[PDB]
Design a protein around this ligand. Structure first.
Ligand SMILES: [Cu+2]
Ligand SMILES: [Cu+2]
Length: 138
């Protein structure tokens, strides 16, 4: 069962990146593309999924092209991202910081290079980030 959520984010797997939509924060969406100009190697991206600490985050998970899977080991999360299907999982981060995962379903050439990067922040910073993101992402 998915517990009562404080916020929902939709994570859509694509060849070979994730898109994150924020239905509860103004319906903006952005792509999260591997950077590696950035540490850690194979895990850093241009635009992280930002979430508030100490909140139930429902993650709706789907794919856009082929089957992917959303894996976030620090939270015990692993769920298929199947095009045509909206799956759901969740996590609650007990502390701030960076948390990383990977696509866990072989999905072609760049499967190994579509990381999930989550930045957990306090409420104040989350709200400030949302302000900026709404403008950045359109
Ligand atoms: Cu994939
Ligand atoms: Cu994959």
């Amino acid at each position: 069962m998915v517990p009562k959520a404080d916020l929902t984010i939709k994570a859509t797997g694509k060849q070979w990146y994730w898109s994150y939509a924020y239905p509860d924060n103004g319906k903006f969406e952005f792509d999260s593309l591997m950077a590696q100009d950035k540490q850690p190697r194979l895990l850093g991206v241009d635009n992280e999924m930002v979430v508030p600490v100490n909140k139930v985050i429902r993650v709706q998970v789907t794919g856009a092209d082929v089957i992917h899977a959303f894996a976030l080991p620090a939270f015990g999360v692993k769920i298929d991202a199947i095009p045509g299907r909206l799956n759901e999982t969740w996590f609650k981060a007990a502390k701030t910081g960076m948390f990383y995962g990977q696509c866990s379903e072989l999905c072609g050439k760049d499967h190994a290079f579509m990381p999930i990067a989550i930045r957990v922040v306090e409420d104040k910073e989350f709200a400030s980030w949302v302000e900026t993101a709404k403008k950045k992402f359109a």
